[PDB]
Each structure stands twice: as C-alpha cells, then as structure tokens.
Design a protein around this ligand. Structure first.
Ligand SMILES: OC[C@H]1O[C@H](O[C@H]2[C@H](O)[C@@H](O)[C@@H](O)O[C@@H]2CO)[C@H](O)[C@@H](O)[C@@H]1O
Lengths: 471, 22
C-alpha cells in the first residue's frame, strides 16, 4: 500500500508485533472508517529516507529512536504536537529519547534492551561471565549441543560485549555528544571484540550466525543460550522450551552494556494524514488496550505508557530487561548514528570472518564513525577571531609594573600579560581540530616583553595541549 | 576517508609549525 489521503500505512520491523498492531488498525477502521495498513518491509530503516521523497514511504514509521535524528535532519518527520496532559502519561526519559533540537519528532512506545535468554533444562545455572563460556561450550559440545548462538550480523547484539570494558559510541560531554570523540577503537573495545573473535577461532561460535539461525537453534533446544530482546519471547513460548531471561554475562568483571532503544513512531512529513496519524497513535495505540494488543503478539519490553508499564513491571522477564537496560546506555539519536552503526557492522563482520584483524577492523571503524568544516571555512573563522582581536587592541593600545601587550599570533589573541608571569589562554573554540579543554601558554618577562625563543627572534609559545589529539 | 579533513588539518599543521616554538 502507498500513501493516499484518508488512509494510514504503517511500517514496523518484521521482528515486532505487526499482527497486533494490525488489530489496533482494524479497531480504528471500525470506529472511524479510516483504513490502516501495517507492513514490515525489509531494511525499512534504510528504505524510509530513500523513498519518502518519491512518494513511496508510509504515513507512520516505527523504529528505535536512534534513527530518528537523521530523519528529522533530512526533513522527513513532522513535529508532533501532543499536549502536556498526553505527555504526562508517558515517562519523561522516553520523551527525551525522541527530542531533536528541542522538538519532539516521534511518539515513544517501548524501552528495549537485550538480555541473556537461557534454556533451564540444559543450563540450570547460566554463566555469570563471558570468560566461562568456552569451557561451558566444550562441555555442551560433548552432549551434542552448544553454549551460545546469537546474531553476529548486526552490531546491536555484539555491542554489549564491546562496550563492557570501555568501548563507547560518542562521548557525552555534559549537555551533548562530541562527534570527534569516538570510543570504537580504545583498549576496552579491542578486548571485547577480540574475545568474540577468539570464541569463533576456538569454534565456540560461527562467524555466519544470523538472527534466524540463532533463533531456530535456541527454539529447537540445540543451544543453551541466546541473546535477544523481548520481541523474541513469544516464539520461545510457542516452542515450549523451558527458558529464563537474566542479566547478560560480565566481561573482565564489568557488566555487559547494551545500547538501549526506545521503539518510537514518527510521522512522515510527506503525509497528507498527519492529524489522523496523531489521532491513531495517541487514542488507539498508546492506550492500555492498544499496547496490550501489540504486546500479546510480540512483547514490547517496558512500555512508555505508565499505566500499562505498572502491570508489565511485575513480569520477571521485564525486570531482567530493566536490569540490563540500567547497566547499558540509551542510544544517542544524533544524525551520526547510522554512520556509527555501519562502521561497527563492517568491523565485527570483518574481524569475525578474519578479513581484518581486530586492530585493523576497529581503526577503520573509528575513521568512519568520525567521518564537514572546510579549510576555506576555517580560514574565515580565523579572520573573524583576528578582526575581533584588532578591535580589542584598538581600545587597549616600577618593578614589574609594565605588562606585556596583547597581540595576534595568527591563531590566538593574547591578552595583557602580567610581568614575570605565565599567561594561559584556552585552546580557541574556532579552531575545529583543537583540544578545547586545553590551554596554550606564553611567558611574559619581568620587563613586560613576551619571552623569545633563545637563538631566534620568535615569541615563545606552547600549543602542545591544543594539538593533543593530532597524534 | 575525507579530503576536506586532509586539507583542513594540513593547513592547521602548517600554521602551528610556525607559531608553536616551545
Ligand atoms: O545492529 C545495528 C542496529 O541496531 C539497532 O537495531 C535494532 C533495533 O533497535 C531492535 O528493535 C531490533 O529490531 O533489532 C535491531 C538490530 O537488528 C538500531 O536501532 C539500528 O538503528 C541499528 O542499525
């Protein structure tokens, strides 16, 4: 189905409760005469920006919140206008997840985090550490079984291990994310990916394992453990495997750190049905009955709606989900997230198959997750700081009573210097490549002259703190 | 990689080399 005035088309991932969502859509049609169609196209999160402009998107797209800053940036999402009374019904932190440049750009639905799912009959006591898995697998392989299978094709599933002992996406520097500070190739990220790679090398896992292979393997009792989200529980219910949902194993003593997603629903900017979409989301879906219809099909996790979450919180599987979430981090929603995920996807696939070493693979991912101010731009910014410096010199211009004079040195404007003192200036904001927490230094001599380099006519200046992160 | 980073960073390296005298 394609967009038409007076109908709704909804896209949601094929792993979620699309049948349940379809039932909410039919209730809406029964009440209003408005047809609601639910589809689950493959790679819908990649398809959406490619086809919205051409007229082939849906009215409403469901995805975790991390993709939505990119869509908003690209002008593909309508700002949503829920009143304060409606906002009060959902948890504050869920609204935060769907805020982009101070505007709400999606309705939050549910909070998702990966957990360790294990087969109680094969594994009464699941491992508390990643390190004990190899010996557990050797033991299980002897009984014609394996310890663990999970999706290796999507970095979302391997991220909790990469992040456990120090990998991170973007550094959160109070207020906001620093896109120049990526934590994909530090020591902890290498340690975590190396462990994954060694499991494969030692034949405790197969580099080609994907979602459906891991799910079939667990749901047929072939493997003792899997790693998956709440949506996976109803297929395990159908399978009648005796399963539990628990905290992810630790790596090097540190909790596994899942990236936590808020399943959200955005409205297509190209839709002529924005009001109908709002009405369906607020009055049909985001109700106890609406969410229960979906949850009954495939579990949502911990829902944004407080009234229904209060009932779901009682489920020990939801408790485990929340414990794992609490140990993880809510994903950024910034436009850069898709570049990050593509880079980490490539790294893990490449390292797992031996195409690259862990070192080669993560170095490249760092380069790509962080890959713009031009030189021409930078030159203008310097010219601006220079003019600002000259305007400053206009107005400005016994023992240790004569200061060094302010000057421009082609990078920084130096202020008045007290004679005999070191003068510190913050590494300037307008230099993109600088370390902005650092200082540059000059020395003002006792006579009020800036200190010169011995054997030369140049002024002594130390910019080593500024260029700290340029190797 | 990206050529704009290369040009920008090379430009800055050149400028720094003259001025940073420590
Ligand atoms: O694997 C990278 C991928 O991770 C996340 O996608 C999750 C999604 O959040 C879950 O709801 C579930 O469907 O599995 C997906 C992984 O297959 C990010 O949300 C997504 O942007 C990213 O590409």
């Amino acid at each position: 189905a394609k967009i038409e005035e007076g109908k709704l088309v909804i896209w949601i991932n094929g792993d979620k409760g699309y049948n349940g969502l379809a039932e909410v859509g039919k209730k809406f049609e029964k009440d209003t005469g408005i047809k609601v169609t639910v589809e689950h196209p493959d790679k819908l999160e990649e398809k959406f920006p490619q086809v919205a402009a051409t007229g082939d998107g849906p009215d409403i797209i469901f995805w975790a919140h991390d993709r939505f800053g990119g869509y908003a940036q690209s002008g593909l999402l309508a700002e949503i206008t829920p009143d304060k009374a409606f906002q009060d019904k959902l948890y504050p932190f869920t609204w935060d997840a769907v805020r982009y440049n101070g505007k709400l750009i999606a309705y939050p639905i549910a909070v998702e985090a990966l957990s360790l799912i294990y087969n109680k009959d094969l594994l009464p006591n699941p491992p508390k550490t990643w390190e004990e898995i190899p010996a557990l697998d050797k033991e299980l392989k002897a009984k014609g079984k394996s310890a663990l299978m999970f999706n290796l094709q999507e970095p979302y599933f391997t991220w909790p291990l990469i992040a456990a002992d120090g990998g991170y996406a973007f550094k959160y520097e109070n207020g906001k994310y620093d896109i120049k500070d990526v934590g994909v190739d530090n020591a902890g990220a290498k340690a975590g990916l190396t462990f994954l790679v060694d499991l494969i090398k030692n034949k405790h896992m197969n580099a080609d394992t994907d979602y459906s292979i891991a799910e079939a393997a667990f749901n047929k009792g072939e493997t003792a453990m899997t790693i998956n989200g709440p949506w996976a529980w109803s297929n395990i219910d159908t399978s009648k495997v005796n399963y539990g949902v628990t905290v992810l194993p630790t790596f090097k003593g540190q909790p596994s750190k899942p990236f936590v997603g808020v399943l959200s629903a955005g409205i297509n900017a190209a839709s002529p049905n924005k009001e109908l979409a709002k009405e369906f989301l607020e009055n049909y879906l985001l109700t106890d009955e609406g969410l229960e219809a979906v949850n009954k099909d495939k579990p949502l996790g911990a829902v944004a709606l407080k009234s229904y979450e209060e009932e779901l919180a009682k489920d020990p599987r939801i408790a485990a989900t929340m414990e794992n979430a609490q140990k993880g981090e809510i994903m950024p929603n910034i436009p850069q997230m898709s570049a990050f995920w593509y880079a980490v996807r490539t790294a893990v696939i490449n390292a797992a198959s031996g195409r690259q070493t862990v070192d080669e693979a993560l170095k490249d991912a760092q380069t790509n997750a962080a890959a713009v101010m031009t030189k021409e731009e930078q030159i203008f910014l310097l010219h601006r700081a220079q003019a600002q410096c000259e305007k400053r010199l206009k107005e400005v211009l016994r023992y240790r009573g004569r200061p060094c004079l302010p000057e421009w040195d082609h990078i920084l404007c130096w202020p008045l210097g007290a004679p005999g003192e070191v003068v510190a200036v913050p590494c300037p904001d307008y230099i993109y490549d600088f370390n902005h927490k650092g200082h540059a230094y000059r020395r003002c001599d006792r006579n009020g002259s800036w200190e010169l380099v011995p054997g030369h006519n140049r002024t002594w200046a130390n910019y080593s703190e500024c260029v700290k992160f340029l190797t | 990689k990206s050529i704009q980073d290369l040009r920008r960073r090379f430009f800055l390296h050149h400028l720094i080399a003259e001025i940073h005298t420590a």
